[model samples]
Target: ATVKFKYKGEEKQVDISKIKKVWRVGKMISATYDEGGGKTGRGAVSEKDAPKELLQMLEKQK
Candidate 1:
């Protein structure tokens, strides 16, 4: 999948057992980060074909 937002920022391009969820909202892909436990982050794909969204969780990337 394409990144919705410009690397607004990142935590190494490596995978840390990342558990991501992508929703098929009528071709418009929405995503969320399930950081184990009961926490989550929300995001969606930009109309420009990029993924973007505010990190909706209370934690920061390690």
Candidate 2:
């Protein structure tokens, strides 16, 4: 699945394979992915604002 959200203040679309993990911290939704040297993170979209498909993927992980 694909999800649209903001990453570093810019809108982005991420495929499910590109995403490594996702979690919630307070009101922010943190999505981590593999990068050149190590893991990278993109987040801050709250529960009510996050994409439904992305949220479902996160729920499946847990």
Candidate 3:
């Protein structure tokens, strides 16, 4: 899989490969992540936590 990597105000597509190690734990739940460098940035869905000016500006078009 690939996704956008934004750095230095520029954007590019990067390959993202994740390895899965499944476990039963006596249940049907499963989890996965990159073996070493799976993800690049911080954790999930923190947009609401972003400062209002930046978040609001994100919605605007140039």
Candidate 4:
């Protein structure tokens, strides 16, 4: 499965398994993952903008 969302004015598509952690702050859903070389990448999307698949995946992280 993939998580698709917009972050920092750019669109992103990341594999679900790549996400290290996921959390919500206010209405924003944020995730952290490694982008190789041990670099951490972060992405966020509002709750209303998130797809059902993304929401389900986030729930499983809890």
| Candidate 2 off by > 4 Å | 7-11, 36-39, 48-62
Q: Per-residue CA lDDT of candidate 3, range 1-62, in tens?
A: 23223334645333334423332334332333454666523222122222334334445768
lDDT of 1 by residue, 1-62 (tens): 43443246654332224547554457656556556787765554546644333233324544
lDDT of 4 by residue, 1-62 (tens): 35666645655576766766666667666667767768877667666545566556545775
Off by over 4 Å in 3: 1-17, 35-62
**Predicted model with the maximum lDDT:** 4
Cα miss at 36, model 1 (Å)? 3.6
Model-by-model lDDT, in order?
A: 0.48, 0.58, 0.35, 0.64
lDDT of 2 by residue, 1-62 (tens): 34455645666665556656656566556667655577676555555545567555545775
Output the better candidate (1/2) by TM-score: 2
Sort every candidate by lDDT, greatest first.
4, 2, 1, 3
**How much lDDT does candidate 4 score?**
0.64
- Candidate achieving higher lDDT, 1 or 3: 1
Cα error, residue 57 of model 3, in Å, equals 50
All candidates' TM-scores?
A: 0.36, 0.48, 0.21, 0.53
Root-mean-square deviation per candidate: 11.5, 4.0, 13.6, 3.9
Assess candidate 2 and give its TM-score to the true structure. Answer: 0.48
Candidate 3, residue 55: the lDDT equals 35
Off by over 4 Å in 4: 7-12, 53-62
